Amino acid sequence: GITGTWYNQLGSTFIVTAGADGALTGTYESAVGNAESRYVLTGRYDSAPATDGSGTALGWTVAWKNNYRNAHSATTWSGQYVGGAEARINTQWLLTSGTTEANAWKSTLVGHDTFTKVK
Amino acid sequence: GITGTWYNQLGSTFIVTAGADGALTGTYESAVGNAESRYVLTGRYDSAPATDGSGTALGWTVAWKNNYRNAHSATTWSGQYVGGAEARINTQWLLTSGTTEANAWKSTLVGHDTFTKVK
Amino acid sequence: GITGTWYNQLGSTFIVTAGADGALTGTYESAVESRYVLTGRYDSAPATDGSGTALGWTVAWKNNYRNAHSATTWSGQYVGGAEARINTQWLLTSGTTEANAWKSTLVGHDTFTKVK
Amino acid sequence: GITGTWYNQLGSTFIVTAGADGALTGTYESAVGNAESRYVLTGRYDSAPATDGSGTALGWTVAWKNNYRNAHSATTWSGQYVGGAEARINTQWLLTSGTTEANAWKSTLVGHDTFTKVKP
Ligand SMILES: O=C(O)CCCC[C@@H]1[Se]C[C@@H]2NC(=O)N[C@@H]21
Ligand SMILES: O=C(O)CCCC[C@@H]1[Se]C[C@@H]2NC(=O)N[C@@H]21
Ligand SMILES: O=C(O)CCCC[C@@H]1[Se]C[C@@H]2NC(=O)N[C@@H]21
Ligand SMILES: O=C(O)CCCC[C@@H]1[Se]C[C@@H]2NC(=O)N[C@@H]21
């Protein structure tokens, strides 16, 4: 279900494996921002979700440092997987940059990403 | 400086190891919510932060399922670690519960936690 | 371009008047009677480089018929053109006791359009 | 207890009047960001809050344009007033800047401000 390759509305690529233990592991490649190529992600998901039609809660983190570039920032996505004919992961995210203490008020962006397995 | 035990303002306990590769691994024990005992956490941090006084960006996820309870929800914390004698991890968080599609509008809580080395 | 009736994807409606001073006034008709006062502000002199027009408004969920002891603010931007939109993120805070304040605020997003 | 002069943890000044109709009016002066002097605010608050010890929900908006400066941005604060012993307004806020469509993903900052009546 969750395991596979997903794309968000920006064209970013989220390759994830959902482990039986509730673990999420994989790579994220952002189409935007101070990022290039793949970054490691790790996360957790509800491996025993409700059976009443509710989505599956999940979250994951990317710290935007790889072998090529370091943005000194990290994003967490929090959301739920909705299965079915048109599988989607609906997320909201927080991106925090490292700042000085005086600039901490503007450290964190918020947004929302929707992932499907298409394009 | 990140590795060790941290406590937030609500009385929750965050036990974490910061790996050399940027991995965060540990356990979270929540003082509030549909939670009981320890939960696995995983996350990522900037393992090569700026040397200009900026904090160290980081994030982690807890899915609120363990051997004792399943809240069908997951929280991600996004923030930065700030060193010194009064070291802190300042975070904002998103808590998404699994919902049906009709209730997705109320799926996600937002808040902020500050973690310190002493409590 | 802001003044008029807008519809979200959830069947809510709001009618707003954008005053020359930057004021937003109108009524929000929810879906998830149900009309509530809305007030807000918008940038009355936006950039002319294709940037959106920043704006925000608040609705306190009390009227003559019910009171949910809560308030939503929407923060976003108006984007003009053929498919005009107001893209928003919102925060809904409910009145809680201090012990429950950690769970007082929901966050989401809404997109409003001039059609349907 | 909402009406008065409030200051947040940054030293910003929030001057507000709560109208009997649920209206919030006043001025906001930010200690940080692309802002100078006072800006108009408007908002709403629950004028018949619960009597069980719960706070009073409220929210307000500032568009960061005044006679001196225009940041092409607007902030909304959503929060609750908590009386008793030491009056406080605890908020979370969203600051949206006007952006191109390509830059809309980075349009919105989020944070939290706590206000008390204690001058810096
Ligand atoms: O610019 C930076 O600091 C690092 C790049 C972050 C890109 C952000 Se993550 C939330 C949003 N979703 C996405 O795919 N890319 C953007
Ligand atoms: O109630 C649930 O769904 C699981 C428990 C959630 C606890 C939340 Se995580 C954000 C906040 N910080 C904390 O330590 N506990 C609360
Ligand atoms: O349940 C309540 O508190 C009263 C109705 C709240 C409606 C919320 Se405002 C954010 C979201 N957008 C919308 O149109 N309706 C929901
Ligand atoms: O920089 C801009 O775009 C306009 C100024 C925004 C200042 C932000 Se509003 C949230 C935070 N609280 C405060 O008092 N000032 C800052």
Side-chain angles (χ1 to χ4, degrees):
Chain A
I2 301 173
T3 294
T5 301
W6 300 81
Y7 308 92
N8 74 3
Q9 74 290 345
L10 302 175
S12 301
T13 297
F14 171 42
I15 300 171
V16 63
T17 297
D21 56 348
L24 295 179
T25 59
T27 60
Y28 200 96
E29 182 164 0
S30 180
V32 299
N34 184 20
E36 71 185 275
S37 199
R38 297 182 171 172
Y39 295 79
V40 177
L41 70 93
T42 183
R44 304 290 298 174
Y45 77 102
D46 180 6
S47 53
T51 58
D52 63 350
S54 288
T56 298
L58 46 64
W60 71 90
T61 305
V62 172
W64 297 102
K65 166 186 181 289
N66 64 7
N67 296 312
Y68 307 101
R69 192 179 292 209
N70 188 357
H72 305 306
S73 69
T75 297
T76 63
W77 288 259
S78 182
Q80 51 182 327
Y81 163 80
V82 191
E86 333 256 1
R88 281 171 49 176
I89 299 171
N90 296 318
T91 69
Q92 310 218 230
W93 54 257
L94 294 175
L95 165 59
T96 305
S97 305
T99 67
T100 65
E101 300 188 14
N103 291 329
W105 71 271
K106 50 178 186 184
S107 66
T108 306
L109 289 166
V110 61
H112 48 104
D113 284 351
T114 305
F115 296 85
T116 76
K117 297 192 164 172
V118 169
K119 99 169 180 179
Chain B
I2 294 170
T3 289
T5 298
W6 296 85
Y7 308 94
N8 73 8
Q9 76 290 338
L10 295 168
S12 298
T13 293
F14 171 44
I15 292 171
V16 69
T17 303
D21 60 341
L24 294 182
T25 315
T27 65
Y28 200 93
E29 182 170 2
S30 184
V32 301
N34 190 5
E36 160 181 8
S37 188
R38 295 153 191 79
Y39 295 84
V40 175
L41 75 92
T42 187
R44 301 289 297 171
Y45 75 99
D46 180 5
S47 55
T51 56
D52 63 355
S54 296
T56 296
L58 51 64
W60 71 92
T61 305
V62 172
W64 300 107
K65 164 176 189 305
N66 64 11
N67 287 333
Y68 305 95
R69 278 175 196 232
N70 190 351
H72 304 305
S73 61
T75 302
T76 63
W77 289 257
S78 180
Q80 45 189 327
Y81 159 85
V82 188
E86 310 276 347
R88 290 168 306 270
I89 302 177
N90 294 318
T91 67
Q92 297 187 80
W93 53 258
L94 289 173
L95 166 54
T96 305
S97 304
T99 66
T100 60
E101 306 90 345
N103 291 325
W105 72 270
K106 58 180 176 175
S107 68
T108 307
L109 291 166
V110 58
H112 46 97
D113 284 340
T114 304
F115 294 87
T116 54
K117 298 300 298 182
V118 306
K119 198 55 209 60
Chain C
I2 297 168
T3 293
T5 299
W6 294 84
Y7 306 95
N8 75 352
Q9 359 84 63
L10 292 188
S12 297
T13 301
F14 77 89
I15 178 128
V16 66
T17 302
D21 59 345
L24 292 186
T25 61
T27 74
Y28 200 92
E29 182 170 340
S30 63
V32 294
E33 225 201 351
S34 72
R35 296 186 168 112
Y36 300 85
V37 176
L38 84 77
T39 187
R41 302 290 297 173
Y42 74 100
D43 178 7
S44 56
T48 58
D49 64 341
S51 288
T53 295
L55 46 63
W57 70 93
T58 306
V59 171
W61 299 109
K62 168 187 183 299
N63 64 17
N64 295 340
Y65 301 92
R66 52 197 201 260
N67 185 0
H69 303 306
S70 60
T72 300
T73 64
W74 291 256
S75 177
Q77 48 190 323
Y78 160 84
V79 184
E83 296 94 358
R85 276 148 35 242
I86 300 180
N87 296 136
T88 69
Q89 304 196 67
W90 56 257
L91 291 175
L92 196 161
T93 304
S94 301
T96 64
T97 68
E98 288 187 351
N100 291 329
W102 69 271
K103 57 183 173 185
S104 65
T105 308
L106 292 173
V107 55
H109 53 274
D110 248 320
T111 300
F112 297 89
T113 51
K114 285 178 163 293
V115 170
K116 197 194 54 55
Chain D
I2 295 172
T3 296
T5 303
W6 299 84
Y7 306 86
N8 71 9
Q9 74 291 346
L10 304 174
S12 300
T13 305
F14 172 42
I15 300 172
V16 67
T17 297
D21 61 332
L24 256 23
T25 49
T27 62
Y28 199 97
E29 176 167 6
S30 179
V32 295
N34 185 15
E36 68 186 277
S37 194
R38 294 183 172 176
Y39 295 79
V40 170
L41 68 93
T42 183
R44 305 288 297 171
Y45 76 102
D46 186 354
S47 53
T51 51
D52 58 3
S54 296
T56 296
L58 44 60
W60 71 92
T61 302
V62 171
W64 296 102
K65 169 184 176 306
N66 66 6
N67 292 338
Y68 308 105
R69 190 179 287 208
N70 189 357
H72 305 303
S73 61
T75 298
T76 59
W77 289 257
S78 171
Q80 52 179 326
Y81 163 80
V82 186
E86 170 200 283
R88 194 169 289 263
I89 297 176
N90 290 325
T91 68
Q92 307 228 223
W93 53 256
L94 293 173
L95 165 57
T96 302
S97 300
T99 67
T100 63
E101 299 193 47
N103 284 335
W105 67 271
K106 49 175 178 185
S107 70
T108 306
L109 293 167
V110 58
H112 50 282
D113 281 351
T114 182
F115 300 83
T116 74
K117 291 184 170 168
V118 179
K119 191 181 59 177

